[PDB]
């Protein structure tokens, strides 16, 4: 049984994630706000029409889980609850499907398609999805996710962080860094 403090921490993580969707900072998000992220992803990666649409479709699939139904506008904390409720219910192969979105993003960073990403690659991608993010924030994020301190992050290393952020009930440095400083 998930404890009150584990639920508190997971929701805190999810609210931090959802606040990234809230591009005007009004405390509310919608389906098209989520699609905007996929559009920014396609632009920086220079995705083909087909790959760009696959990226959009995956974001829409996740939007459904987040309660970002067509036409609705919901609070960042309501979306966070939907995220926590959905993610913590998942078992086995469901959890593999849950990281597909992040693996699509990793491919977009990984310009050589070799299963490694450098700081320049990572920073360019992160500041495209989040142009409000300072160089300090982007580089801090890279440095932490580079947990083996090789100056590059492997696909498997990235997946460790994604899993810990999405499913972790206990606090870690990686989960505390993936979406920047966690929000109240």
- Backbone angles phi and psi of 152, in degrees to 5: -160, 150
Experimental method: X-ray
d(Cα 17, Cα 91) in Å, to the nearest integer? Answer: 22
| Resolution limit, Å | 1.7
Distances (CA, A) of 5 to 1, 12, 14, 116: 12, 10, 14, 35
Provide the 10 A C-beta neighbour count for residue 127. Answer: 16
Short-list 53, 78, 77, CA closest to 67: 78
d(Cα 34, Cα 23) in Å, to the nearest integer? Answer: 10
Short-list 90, 81, 76, CA closest to 163: 90
Domains of the chain, earliest start first: 1-184 (1.10.238.10)
Rg (CA), the chain: 16
CB contact at 8 A, 83 and 14: yes
d(Cα 12, Cα 85) in Å, to the nearest integer? Answer: 13
């Amino acid at each position: 049984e998930i404890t009150e403090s584990e639920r508190a921490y997971h929701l805190r993580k999810m609210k931090t994630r959802m606040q990234r969707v809230d591009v005007t900072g009004d405390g509310f998000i919608s389906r098209e706000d989520y699609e905007l992220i996929a559009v920014r992803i396609a632009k920086i990666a220079k995705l083909s029409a087909e790959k760009a649409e696959e990226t959009r479709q995956e974001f829409l699939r996740v939007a459904d889980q987040l309660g970002l139904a067509p036409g609705v506008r919901i609070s960042v904390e309501e979306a966070a609850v939907n995220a926590t409720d959905s993610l913590l219910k998942m078992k086995g192969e469901e959890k593999a499907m849950a990281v597909i979105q992040s693996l699509i993003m990793y491919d977009c960073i990984d310009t050589d398609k070799d299963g490694y990403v450098s700081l320049p690659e990572f920073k360019a991608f992160l500041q495209a999805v989040g142009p409000d993010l300072t160089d300090d924030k982007a580089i801090t994020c890279f440095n932490t996710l580079d947990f083996n301190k090789n100056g590059q992050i492997s696909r498997d290393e990235f997946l460790v962080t994604v899993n810990d952020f999405l499913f972790g009930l206990e606090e870690t440095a990686l989960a505390n860094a993936f979406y920047g400083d966690l929000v109240d």
